[PDB]
Design a protein around this ligand. Structure first.
Ligand SMILES: O=C(O)C1CCNCC1
Ligand SMILES: [Mn+2]
Ligand SMILES: [Zn+2]
Length: 442
């Protein structure tokens, strides 16, 4: 079917006017567009991509850590089992660490070596992919991060309309920038973004990347495929067989990202990517204030619990911050947030009264300014307001957080734990009561 190889939603920018034109923002965040490729973005804004060249990076922070993925150089769009007998979903991808200086050396000699060969089923060559380079430190990366403030607001790392800005604390690689250093064949295997948040990716060049994209509403189909190939959709490295997806009638968007092109991945869009040439990429996440984004984010948050996977975005904490600090005028988005908060409030009230009825002291603990959300030290679920801390950890003021279930499993009557409360119930009830639909004519 021709509908199984759809055209890429693509926008061609010439100048700053095109980049700041409001319909660009609305096109990207439109749920009907699973991905938007903003071509010519860097040139349109006169972004200095040279600030992210490998030469520039070595000079700035040569001992900076790089996560290496050692992979096989696979042909085109395929993934073969090590023997070259059949195409499979499972990806070989071993992890190690290096530095920018050391990876840069490899990146350069890799190119020099291919130049020489050019002038001279498997088996497959091994390559190294430099991933997840952390560009959060504004002191180490001052000029780099300043250049990215030249983007239109909706695509920035930080903006008033970015849900991740409203989290109130750092979520590494989501509201901070990640850098990738690549050689041909460097693969980012299949995935959805952390808690289905949108993502921004800019190719630094000089080489191209090739992207494969599947709309959000087909993700269950890909989840089935993983389970049938004994793979964990969320935690395994997998590279879809295109002939399998075609067979199962899954449409696949396919395109080339050139240097300076910005790729916007909409919420929950499934995708995998490979370098065609030698290049660097930068990326981060963004959370538009839309019903679709909030809905998919909450869904994945709950799915992660069932799968025993930690949510990088603390959706309970975020939901309270939205109610505290954001005027919400979309009736659909408002009703979702209101609903979630009511769930949180009722569960908290239920737990709190069960504790008080069993004669357990709830200790007023309050909270520090700009203090991050808490997760259970055992099971890594988000824990909100009522924190379960051992008598000893309390005494030592290390305040090591457990959820209620994990505390109970350890200590049947919670005799080994104190219950800390970070918010008065009156304060949360008030925040909820005062959270009402704002009027907007837009
Ligand atoms: O440039 C890359 O390898 C990536 C693209 C999309 N998500 C994660 C990584
Ligand atoms: Mn991604
Ligand atoms: Zn727990």
């Amino acid at each position: 079917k021709d509908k199984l190889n759809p055209p890429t939603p693509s926008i061609y920018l010439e100048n700053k006017r095109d980049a700041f034109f409001p319909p660009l923002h609305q096109f990207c965040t439109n749920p009907k567009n699973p991905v938007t490729v903003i071509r010519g973005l860097a040139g349109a804004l006169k972004l200095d991509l040279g600030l992210f060249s490998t030469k520039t990076l070595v000079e700035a922070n040569n001992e900076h850590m790089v996560e290496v993925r050692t992979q096989l150089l696979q042909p085109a769009d395929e993934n073969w089992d090590p023997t070259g007998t059949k195409k499979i979903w499972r990806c070989e991808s071993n992890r190690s660490h290096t530095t920018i200086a050391k990876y840069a050396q490899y990146q350069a000699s890799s190119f020099q070596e291919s130049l020489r060969e050019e002038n001279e089923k498997g088996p497959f060559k091994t390559i190294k992919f430099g991933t997840n380079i952390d560009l959060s430190d504004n002191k180490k990366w001052k000029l780099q991060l300043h250049e990215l403030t030249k983007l239109p607001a909706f695509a920035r790392v930080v903006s008033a309309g970015n849900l991740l800005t409203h989290v109130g604390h750092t979520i590494l690689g989501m509201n901070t920038v990640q850098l990738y250093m690549k050689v041909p064949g460097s693969r980012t295997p299949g995935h959805q973004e952390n808690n289905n948040f949108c993502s921004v990716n800019i190719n630094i060049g000089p080489g191209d990347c090739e992207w494969f994209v599947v709309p959000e509403d087909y993700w269950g189909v890909l989840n089935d495929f993983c389970e049938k190939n004994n793979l964990n959709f969320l935690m395994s490295s997998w590279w879809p067989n295109l002939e399998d997806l075609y067979e199962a009638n899954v449409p696949v968007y396919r395109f080339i990202q050139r240097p300076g092109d910005l790729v916007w991945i909409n919420a929950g869009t499934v995708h995998w990517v490979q370098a065609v040439g030698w290049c660097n990429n930068i990326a981060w996440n963004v959370g538009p204030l839309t019903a679709c984004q909030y809905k998919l984010a909450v869904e994945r948050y709950e799915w992660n619990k069932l799968k025993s996977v930690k949510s990088p975005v603390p959706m309970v904490h975020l939901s309270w911050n939205m109610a505290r600090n954001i005027k919400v005028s979309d009736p659909k988005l408002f009703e979702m947030i209101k609903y979630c908060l009511l769930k949180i409030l009722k569960q908290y009230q239920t737990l709190r009264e069960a504790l008080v009825a069993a004669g357990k002291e709830v200790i007023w603990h309050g909270r520090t300014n700009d203090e991050p959300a808490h997760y259970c030290s055992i099971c890594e679920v988000e824990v909100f307001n009522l924190l379960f801390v051992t008598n000893e950890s309390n005494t030592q003021k290390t305040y090591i957080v457990h959820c209620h279930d994990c505390a109970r499993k350890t200590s049947k009557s919670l005799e080994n734990f104190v219950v800390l409360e970070q918010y008065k119930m009156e304060d949360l009830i008030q925040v909820y009561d005062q959270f009402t639909l704002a009027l907007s004519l837009s």
